[PDB]
Every structure is written in structure tokens, then in C-alpha cells.
Design a protein around this ligand. Sequence first.
Ligand SMILES: OC[C@@H]1O[C@@H](OC[C@@H]2O/C(=N\O)[C@H](O)[C@H]2O)[C@H](O)[C@H]1O
Ligand code: MN
Ligand code: MN
Ligand code: MN
Ligand code: MN
Length: 359
Amino acid sequence: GKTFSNVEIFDPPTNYRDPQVLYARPLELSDGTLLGTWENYSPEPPNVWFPIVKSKDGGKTWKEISKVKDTQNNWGLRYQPQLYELPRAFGKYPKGTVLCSGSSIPSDLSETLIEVYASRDKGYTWEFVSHVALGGEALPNPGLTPVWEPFLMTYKEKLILYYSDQRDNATHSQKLVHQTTTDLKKWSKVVDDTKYANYYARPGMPTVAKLPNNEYIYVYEYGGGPNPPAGSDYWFPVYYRLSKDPQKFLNKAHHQIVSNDGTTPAGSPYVVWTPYGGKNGTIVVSCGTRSEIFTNQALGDASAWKKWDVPQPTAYTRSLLTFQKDPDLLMIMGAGILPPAGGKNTVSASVVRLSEVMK
Ligand SMILES: OC[C@@H]1O[C@@H](OC[C@@H]2O/C(=N\O)[C@H](O)[C@H]2O)[C@H](O)[C@H]1O
Ligand SMILES: [Mn+2]
Ligand SMILES: [Mn+2]
Ligand SMILES: [Mn+2]
Ligand SMILES: [Mn+2]
């Protein structure tokens, strides 16, 4: 069998700094190997790194094979890792190269620097490729200028790196932006993806998936979005946009995700698409404040979102992975909650079948 529930990947030493672990991310290679990583809050020195775990049995067991380390800044690789496998070459990086992007940040949190590292041997060793984006102080407060949360995706002959940007700090508390490259070394000028006229709005945490009608779905948390629930004054509802050209989300209409029973997912979302479920496949979305998954089999029709229970617990930016050889299988991976986490975060995962979950 392929399914399992709550398999522990990593339990941190008890002396790791709160939250100890956070922000889990998985990747499936073209040979079926799985890699995984997370924010690893070790006592420094040495500078923090991103651990790389590998599974050859579809996620049932895991072993650390390497670390991605900051070789450039003497700061560490600290926040928001993202793994990606090149589906075609980009200059001297061929198809099957594994990228790890993430944010290099000094211990004192005074700067943020989105980097790209590459592995030419399926995750055993890593090399620095390029600096992408430099920002200011690594706290999510209006007026500071950090960059955060890289997400990588190919579109035709470009590689696009989507992220959150606080550097337009006189006009947007935070906005969503991207840059593109064709060689992994030179990055285009910043292009806006989503921004809101309310200064205090904080769209954040972009993820993107490709749909079978040649459209892309772009999902984010809309901080400051309308209709915050009773008692609260600011919330992070999950919104999305649809576009044929994934460099042009900025001019598209936005849509809140609300399931047919009225549930409104909020926080740190993650989207994938799988061919499972019909000609439109299934869009699957997780959010960071509840344990269910949200599905859509109508190409993002705003009235067609459903919600289903799964065994994987709620986690900040809980992530998802679809398996190429079996589109019915979905991995759900998390590394716990935002601090204070009380020493209790671990990295874990579950693999479910959508045909079983969606009954
Ligand atoms: O990854 C670690 C966390 O990141 C920092 O939050 C950054 C904000 O996260 C978002 N979603 O809630 C926004 O896009 C960013 O502004 C936080 O300090 C830390 O725990
Ligand atoms: Mn243990
Ligand atoms: Mn523990
Ligand atoms: Mn439920
Ligand atoms: Mn079964």
C-alpha cells in the first residue's frame, strides 16, 4: 500500500529554538524519489541550514542526505525554503537539476535575501546559483522592507520566482511580485502580481498551479481582506486568481475560497493540481489554520469548492504533493505551528487517496 497517516519525518532536539521546525516542503523527482526540507531553528553557530531528507518508498521512511548551507553571506539559510525540479534546462542547469530557494537572513534578522541553490546530483550536494532579491528587516510589520516566501515555476522559456515584497513600503504594507530568468543567473525587473490600494492589506504566501485548460491558478493569503469574522478586525482569507499567462495575475479578478458549507479557509495556503477526478482534474488547496483540504473540479469556479477531512493535522503553510505515477495519491506535509509552539512542532506527513477522502 501507498497510504499512511502521520509518519514522523523529524523530531527536533529539545534545545532547538522555538518554533524549532516550521515550513515543510516536499518534492518528487522524475525517478520517484521524494525530497523534503523545512526551517531548522538550530542553536547558532554554525549558521542555520536547510535539511534535505530523502524517501525512496513514497514517504514511509526518510533519511537526511544533505544540508543546504549559506556559502555566500555568513548568515545562514533561515526562512521559507522551497524545492523545485527543473522540467527543462535553464542555461547550464539541465533538466532534473533540483533547486532550493529560500531566504538567507542574519541571526539578528536585520536583512532578507532570497537565494537559489542547485543540486546536480538529486539532492546530495548543493551549489550557490544566484541572489534574487534583497530586502530589509525580517519582521512582518508595516514600514519594514523584507522579502519573503519564494515559489518557483516554469512558464515556456522562463523560470518565474514568485514572492512577497515589503519594499514598496510607502504604498503597500506588503505586495506580491515576481522576477523571471532564463539562465538562473540574471533576474528580470520586478513585476507586480497582486497589490491592494488599502495600505494595510498584506497579500502574501503565493503558490501556483497549472490547470488542464492551459490556465494557471494563483493562490495567496489576502491579509486585510474583507469581512473579517466576528470579534476579529484583520484576517488572512485565502484568495485566488486565474490566468492563461502566469506573469499577468495582476489584472485578473480575485476570488475568495468559500466551500459549499460556507467554510472560509484562512492563512498560509498551498495549491496543487492533479489529473485525478475527471477531464478538469482536481485543484487541491490547504490553508494554515485548519486541517481539511479544499477541492475544486470545475477549473476554479468560485461556487464549486468542497471541503474534506484528512488525518494530517493543521500546520502553518502545510504543503501538498501529487504523485506523477498515481494522481489519486496526495501527500500532505507539515512542520507545526507558528511560535510559540511549546516545544511540540515536528515534521510529519500523510499520504491519502482522493477517491477515499472525497466520499
Ligand atoms: O517563515 C517564518 C515566519 O515568517 C515571518 O512571517 C513572514 C510573513 O509570513 C506571511 N504570512 O503570514 C507574510 O507573507 C509574511 O509577511 C515570521 O516572522 C516567521 O515566524
Ligand atoms: Mn522523538
Ligand atoms: Mn519533540
Ligand atoms: Mn472537519
Ligand atoms: Mn484503500
